[PDB]
Design a protein around this ligand. Structure first.
Ligand SMILES: O=C(O)CCC(=O)C(=O)O
Ligand SMILES: O=C(O)CCC(=O)C(=O)O
Ligand SMILES: [Co+2]
Ligand SMILES: [Co+2]
Lengths: 199, 194
């Protein structure tokens, strides 16, 4: 099958940065990427997460995705070149923190048949590692026996838009328990069609 | 099965450097490793290769302090004493050069098979403009060259079909050039005593 990700060679030359292609698992397509985010961009994304939370009072505490800003739009543009899909298909920079012994149990990123979101389903994912994880925290694909270990500024790309649906089901993945330290990530989930309202 | 490479977590701490564990294919074990050699160490290994060729009596490097220090770091990574290593084998690909898919271990009934290879570390000593990936055709997996990085894999399994899955090669270099050092590790001590 043809893939969305359409990049030959060892680097991806985007407008503001050069991405390194580190390794590939060819089908379903899984790619480890280097140099995706600067150290300072990783730190700044974390900070935006903590600030948005620090502004919660009784958004209301009683009732995730960063607010759009110069930094998030610059990063979404860069991601857009990597993923070969316009930024408007992106759900936005979703920030996630794992404390020790937290994990993300294996799942599919594309939506179940019963979600209304399945009207415009997800097609591909980028997981960016915003810090270094003392122990644990690997992104693992249990049906492929593959795992990507977190590393600040690196990312894992994968897609699930294949005609053969058994290939999409191979993209079952999760975030392994953090056994020491903590883990910060940004995820960009990309939809088949435009997702953000115009701007 | 258990594996030779025995390293939990995300870094491997050696005496002089901290290696980064980047990605793992679990079986046969294939590991992408980061921060294995400094840029200075990479360049110096290339120059040693070139200088050794200059003295040509028309290649493994000769033993010196650098190679011993690197081989000691590698032994920590691979969990096997350096005396098992064949030595730093330097290899240069020019454009359109390739290493067709092969096994690193010797045929079971070859002369060298009495002390067969059990694991390989391929260290990328420069950046390759295009091509030159280390590919495992039966596994649909490739590791692209990155200066300072490396790929580890082992083929010491009881189930021989696992070892056969370690078939691999060096894809053609289509732009630039490619330099690598390889450490091939033997089941038993290999270097004469020193
Ligand atoms: O934490 C991880 O490594 C996996 C994250 C993930 O699966 C997701 O964000 O969709
Ligand atoms: O050049 C490569 O990437 C492959 C090296 C290799 O197969 C070996 O040294 O045994
Ligand atoms: Co996910
Ligand atoms: Co080989």
């Amino acid at each position: 099958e043809q893939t969305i990700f359409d990049h030959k060679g060892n680097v991806i030359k985007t407008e503001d940065r050069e991405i390194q292609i580190i390794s590939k698992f060819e089908e379903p397509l899984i790619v480890v990427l280097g140099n995706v985010l600067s150290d300072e961009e990783c730190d700044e994304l974390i900070e935006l997460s903590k600030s948005k939370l620090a502004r919660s009072k009784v958004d209301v505490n009683d009732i995730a995705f960063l607010d759009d800003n110069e930094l998030t739009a610059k990063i979404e543009k860069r991601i857009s070149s990597i993923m070969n899909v316009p930024a408007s298909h992106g759900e936005g920079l979703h920030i996630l923190n794992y404390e020790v012994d937290q994990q993300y149990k294996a799942h599919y990123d594309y939506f179940a048949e019963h979600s209304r979101s399945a009207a415009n389903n997800r097609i591909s994912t980028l997981v960016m590692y915003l810090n270094d994880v003392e122990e644990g925290g690997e992104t693992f694909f249990p049906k492929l026996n593959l795992s990507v270990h977190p590393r600040k500024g690196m990312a894992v790309y994968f897609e699930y838009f294949y005609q053969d649906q058994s290939l999409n089901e191979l993209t079952l993945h999760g975030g392994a328990p953090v056994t020491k330290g903590e883990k910060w990530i940004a995820t960009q989930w990309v939809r088949r069609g435009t997702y953000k309202p115009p701007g």
